[PDB]
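Re: your question from the hallway

Yes, I did run it. Sequences:
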Amino acid sequence: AARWDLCIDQAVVFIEDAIQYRSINHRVDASSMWLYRRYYSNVCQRTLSFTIFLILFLAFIETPSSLTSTADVRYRAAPWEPPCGLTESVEVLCLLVFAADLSVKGYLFGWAHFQKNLWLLGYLVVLVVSLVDWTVSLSLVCHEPLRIRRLLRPFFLLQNSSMMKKTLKCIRWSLPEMASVGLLLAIHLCLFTMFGMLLFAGLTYFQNLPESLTSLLVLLTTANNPDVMIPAYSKNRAYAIFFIVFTVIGSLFLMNLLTAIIYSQFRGYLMKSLQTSLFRRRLGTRAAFEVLSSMVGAVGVKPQNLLQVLQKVQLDSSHKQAMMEKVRSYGSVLLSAEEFQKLFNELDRSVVKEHPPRPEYQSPFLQSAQFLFGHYYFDYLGNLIALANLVSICVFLVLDADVLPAERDDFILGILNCVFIVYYLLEMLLKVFALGLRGYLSYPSNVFDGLLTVVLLVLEISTLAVYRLSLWDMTRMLNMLIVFRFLRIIPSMKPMAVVASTVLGLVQNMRAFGGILVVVYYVFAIIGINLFRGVIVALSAPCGSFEQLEYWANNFDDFAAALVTLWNLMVVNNWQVFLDAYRRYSGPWSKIYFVLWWLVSSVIWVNLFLALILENFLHKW
Amino acid sequence: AARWDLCIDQAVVFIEDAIQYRSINHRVDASSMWLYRRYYSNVCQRTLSFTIFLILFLAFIETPSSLTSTADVRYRAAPWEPPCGLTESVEVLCLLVFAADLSVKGYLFGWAHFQKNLWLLGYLVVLVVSLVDWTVSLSLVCHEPLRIRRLLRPFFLLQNSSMMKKTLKCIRWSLPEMASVGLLLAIHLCLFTMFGMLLFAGLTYFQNLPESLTSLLVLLTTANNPDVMIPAYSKNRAYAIFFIVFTVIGSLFLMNLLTAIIYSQFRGYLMKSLQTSLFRRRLGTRAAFEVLSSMVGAVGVKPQNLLQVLQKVQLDSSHKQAMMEKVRSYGSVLLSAEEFQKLFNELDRSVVKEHPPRPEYQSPFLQSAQFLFGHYYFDYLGNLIALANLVSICVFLVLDADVLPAERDDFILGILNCVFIVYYLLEMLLKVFALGLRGYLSYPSNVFDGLLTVVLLVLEISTLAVYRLSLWDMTRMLNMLIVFRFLRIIPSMKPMAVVASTVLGLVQNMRAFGGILVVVYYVFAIIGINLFRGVIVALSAPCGSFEQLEYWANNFDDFAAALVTLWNLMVVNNWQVFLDAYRRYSGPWSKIYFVLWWLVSSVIWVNLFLALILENFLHKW
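Structure:
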């Protein structure tokens, strides 16, 4: 009776964990299974993902106030200050649901399991530090300059992710080897600083210990290759050997050695991911069998017990009916153990359909339309005219570019876009009159084409509403959206399937890796804000300086301007210029910030990218 | 009698080919085995390697005459012209030995084998083209401007190499995939040229079709990251998304996709090298057995036939005596087939010894010296004082650097180098009085230390000959060679053995890969000479130009100046500057030269380097 239905709840949650690749380490109770099924719903996990985005969105609208139009410092309508109410209200509202998340994760798990698992403990210490810092900054009227609780926000992203925790373990195992090459590189520098200072001080680059040390470090990433050697090379031809050897040993051996060291841990990444997925499903159904085999009882599981459990699970109805027919094909025989486990190998099949088309009333009208629809040249007529559209934009952009930027003719340009757009409407209306409103939605390219067509006629008819033949801005907007038609010529990839297959495989696997970049940007922005917030003031310079070039838009005055400035240091070109400017404005101890940013971003993460491309390329063969 | 000894010659050359991993496809004759053993000697292969270096050295002393001190064009003592005699004499003397090489390679191989093997045919066509071009340039008095026979010289390097022929086959199999990503990248460019020209011409970078096409191509290799976007970024913050997406799709996906495509062919490089080595030794001894088993005869090979053949082979005497004792341990029994093949597994063992030390006459004198020699702290006392030497050079280079460059004290600097050098002499003289003149040579570090010590005392005593205490140049030369002592602290690599093991493994495997770089430089230099030989003349510039910077040393006027100029384009930094200069001086069709040089050098070869590091790292585990 009661233990009858109680075993049913242990049946349904063990099947559901066996599908979704979860573990079985939660305590089994009566209403906890009401909570377990509800906490893992679609609605609950999507609220938790939305609030994580919210606090990581919130730094755009904090007191540095990145709501302007230009980030340039020489002219900017600066202020938009929100008051002390709303931003600290939405800060504490997200802290409630994370506190609600921790409570139901610890209550549903073991209490002793809570004290052992390090991530739940770190989830707890971050919450109280964020709450103490909230009430302290609320006691004062917002006039605390630096907000330490803003740094702890990316731990909420790292907690609920299951792919970043794998990737952080792989870079933790690579760490004692990366410190050795980092040690060997620092030996390699300070040798050539001493060896350089004998040759050249006996150059504006070699006049001091920290100046020559900086000049070699920037050469190590090859940001000044010709410019650091041209005094010495103009004195003698033989001085080229000193700089050639330094970048061969430095940039070629030791930087590419860091890539091979990181890839040595990611070598079995996807295959060992699939193995622990299948291993968790093996003990999933086995514990489901073991509790169902001992419901009331030889050793077997009654199919009438199966009839109620496989209904209450949440699954695709394709695999659901296949389970249901296969147990109905079985008799009243008690199901064996090996036949129980191999029964759940229906979840490896995948079925792809699109839709069935629909007929008409009049028989010669329907048979002519559908048999010129099943043609394979109908889309090729669309592909031909779209290419004919694109060369027209091509020839007309280059013809008006060179001469007469003010007053161009643009007479035939209107008529060309008319005949193409009304061609685009008639084909998609003939498609839906040959497939159906359901028959047209089943293709993802047709959603892409059908949405793009109905937008362009709105743009065209609006130009046709005010002109007959804001002219230039509408034609520029109309020309821009015609260019996006070229993305529909792309997916006909017949001989180069190895490229499009991995690009899909890459973006399906950048939950972890895109997440790590977000963690690193968000930390280094807020550190960079509090150090260089008001350092650059713009009120006759050397010809290669920060001020001869107009690099004034690259500062750390807000969140949007920090991200682009950190981007331009990540692509390592011309970061000798930023090093000289931030020395001249904020003292020479700022170089430890940029060098540390150079090590995390360019060295570690862009090697981390190449290890993940290499793994996801070499897969299934 | 005659066929008795004739089988002995077929025995010895089949064993020798089985050792040195050669093939058996040469015709077996009487005096051809006299030629086969002599052509493959140590002296013959080393003459062929020296003449290959000679013609590839010869371009330094041709008519562009790269014998100056500076390559700067604004001042240079230009001319040194050798006459028409000697350079065309040494050109034709190397052509004789290559013609002698082709003849004995074809005569010893099959005649029909000659017409099938493509490399021997290409060896023949290159020889007659080089000889026709020699006699044509000799008929005229050297006044032919361009020498087409100079381009065919790297085929002589490619012919006699057995590792470059493997590597060229691996990049030939990768070619139809690299053309697809090259196709997909060209689609990716010309979309954003049209999309860029609508947004920004509606910037000095976006004013034309070939100007905007060049600006995106240089952004693709990130050579102008901040400088190409700062007008648009200073107009609006939202224009950063256009350039961020272009370098994420461009540089991160598609360039790193080219590395993964190349590495997909080098994935089994070293293991499939070892397999075809062992496979050639398997059929080597088997054909040696098969001719020896049918000398006069159950089925076996008489050991008295073995006694004469294993003497006449050339081998290490360590494995030679081990073969000889093992056949002497065998009786007069006819040796079986399986026991014949497993007999030659002595060639897998390797024995390392150094030397035995020698005693003295007087027993308390020898026993005290050798037992404080077997100490392991004797070298640690050398390691301590060498570190104490290096901090002295460290502290004294930084102290005199900042102030007073003219007249420094340098009083204690002499005395510091005295006590260290005479320490260095007494330790190596106590080492040879505890090891021996033979006992000291057996260590490669002691050869390195012993040579460095005897040089520094010559430098020190020469300063002591003219001073007592050209001063500064001698102390600068003395300080420089003390820095090289730090290379002896390095080889005590206890916890990071994975780094030093592969660095040895890399340089033992760059016969192929260093050879390909030589082929690519040598071709692209001589093409670049004949196009831009006298284009730059130096007789108030924009502040970032080729002439504001003093880049005048980077031209193509000779062979030494071409190599450094091609080097500074290989490391891709600031190659926007070279593109603008060579447009302004030699017309706009010069950009096809540098773009083609960008594709071969940076894209292919530096991806080729990272594939070879990755293979030689992941080896034996």
